[PDB]
């Protein structure tokens, strides 16, 4: 499974769409040193937890654009999965 905490924001209109039910859906996990404010690629500001986090994103482009934003927080542990609607979770980032 994935088993991560969800960051603190009041919901967006970006979020996830019908593709997350139909074609595929991605998800990025990172283990944070502390709680602080970062940005969502969906739009707006949020607040990460301490320890393992989780953000269900729409495309793979979002998680690597987010992972560059996490690199200036000394967070180089982010791992994107590919969650198919049949339940098939595929580890895609990194390659190993």
């Amino acid at each position: 499974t994935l088993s991560g905490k969800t960051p603190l924001f009041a919901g967006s209109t970006g979020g996830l769409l019908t593709k997350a039910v139909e074609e595929e859906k991605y998800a990025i996990t990172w283990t944070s040193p502390k709680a602080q404010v970062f940005e969502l690629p969906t739009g707006g500001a949020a607040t990460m937890h301490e320890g393992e986090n989780l953000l269900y994103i729409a495309r793979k482009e979002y998680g690597i654009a987010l992972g560059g934003q996490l690199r200036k927080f000394k967070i180089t542990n982010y791992k994107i999965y590919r969650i198919l609607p049949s339940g098939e979770t595929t580890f895609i980032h990194p390659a190993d």
Binding site: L17, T18, K19, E23, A58, R59, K60, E61
Partner: peptide, 9 residues
């Protein structure tokens, strides 16, 4: 395809 068009939908 859908992945190369950059469509979130």
């Amino acid at each position: 395809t859908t992945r190369s068009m950059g469509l979130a939908y």
